[PDB]
Every structure is written in structure tokens, then in C-alpha cells.
Design a binder for this molecule. Structure first.
Ligand code: VO4
Length: 149
């Protein structure tokens, strides 16, 4: 089991970026991956996942930035479709955990219906670094507004 990952539920985990020598480790444990980092900051081609039979969502988010709400909902519908199929899903950015922590928090709100204050508490209990910037928090507040309506 790849110990840098942290699970927010049975099926969805978030982590820093796996390096090349960790790809098999992660392919063993995860069937799908959400890559939040721009192609240019990758030390390998995302075809490394395809050759291992891992499904990839590449939805880049700039460093220290938040996704739009539209981008965040697309990501959540995709994770949901993967978990539906019985796959386990790893979310990662670089090292910061701002972006990945944001998506982790959102997954709890989207899938389990947690209020933002509790989902944020859970994720930050896992990684004190999760959700680093005010725009990240704000897009989560926007998501909550969206779901309650
Ligand atoms: O660029 V971050 O994913 O540490 O907000």
C-alpha cells in the first residue's frame, strides 16, 4: 500500500505527485488518477498511466490557484463515475496539497453531503496542508451553495 496517499473514504485518496519509480506502486492500488498539475510540471508523460491500464483525468489547475466551480463539478462527476465502477481513485497535484486537498474536500461534500465545515475538518485532519488559499476555500463555499439548491 502506497503510504503517502490519504483516503477520505473507502475509494478516494489524495497525495503528492508519484515519481516515476512509484508508478507501479500506485497502479497496484488505484485504477484511476486525477492529475491536477500542468503538463509542463510533470517528470514523465501521462502515457505512463495508459500503458499500465490506469484511467486518467488531466484537469490542470495552476499552482496556488483554485479551479472554477464548473471545472470542480466536472472533476467530481468523473470521480463519481469511477467509484461507481468499483475503482479506487487517487487525486494529486505537486507537493502543496492546496489543489488536491480542495478536490478531496469537495468529494466529501459531493458524495457524502457533508457541510463544508466538517469536510474541511476531515481533510485537514488527514493533511494539515489541505486547502491553502482563500480562492480555494471560496470555490468550496460556492460548491456548497450549489448543492443545497
Ligand atoms: O499550488 V497549491 O496545490 O500548494 O495551492
Amino acid at each position: 500500500m502506497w503510504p503517502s496517499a490519504r483516503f477520505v473514504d473507502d475509494n478516494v485518496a489524495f497525495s503528492r505527485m508519484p515519481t516515476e519509480r512509484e508508478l507501479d506502486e500506485v497502479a497496484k492500488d488505484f485504477d484511476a488518477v486525477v492529475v491536477l498539475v500542468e503538463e509542463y510540471e510533470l517528470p514523465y508523460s501521462l502515457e505512463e498511466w495508459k500503458k499500465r491500464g490506469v484511467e486518467v483525468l488531466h484537469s490542470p489547475i495552476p499552482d496556488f490557484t483554485a479551479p472554477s466551480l464548473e471545472q470542480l463539478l466536472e472533476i467530481l462527476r468523473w470521480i463519481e463515475a469511477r467509484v461507481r465502477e468499483g475503482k479506487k481513485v487517487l487525486i494529486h497535484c505537486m507537493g502543496g496539497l492546496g489543489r488536491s486537498g480542495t478536490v478531496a474536500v469537495a468529494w466529501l461534500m459531493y458524495s457524502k453531503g457533508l457541510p463544508l465545515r466538517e469536510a474541511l475538518r476531515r481533510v485537514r485532519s488527514l493533511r494539515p496542508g489541505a486547502v491553502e488559499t482563500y480562492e480555494q476555500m471560496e470555490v468550496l463555499k460556492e460548491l456548497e451553495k450549489f448543492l443545497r439548491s
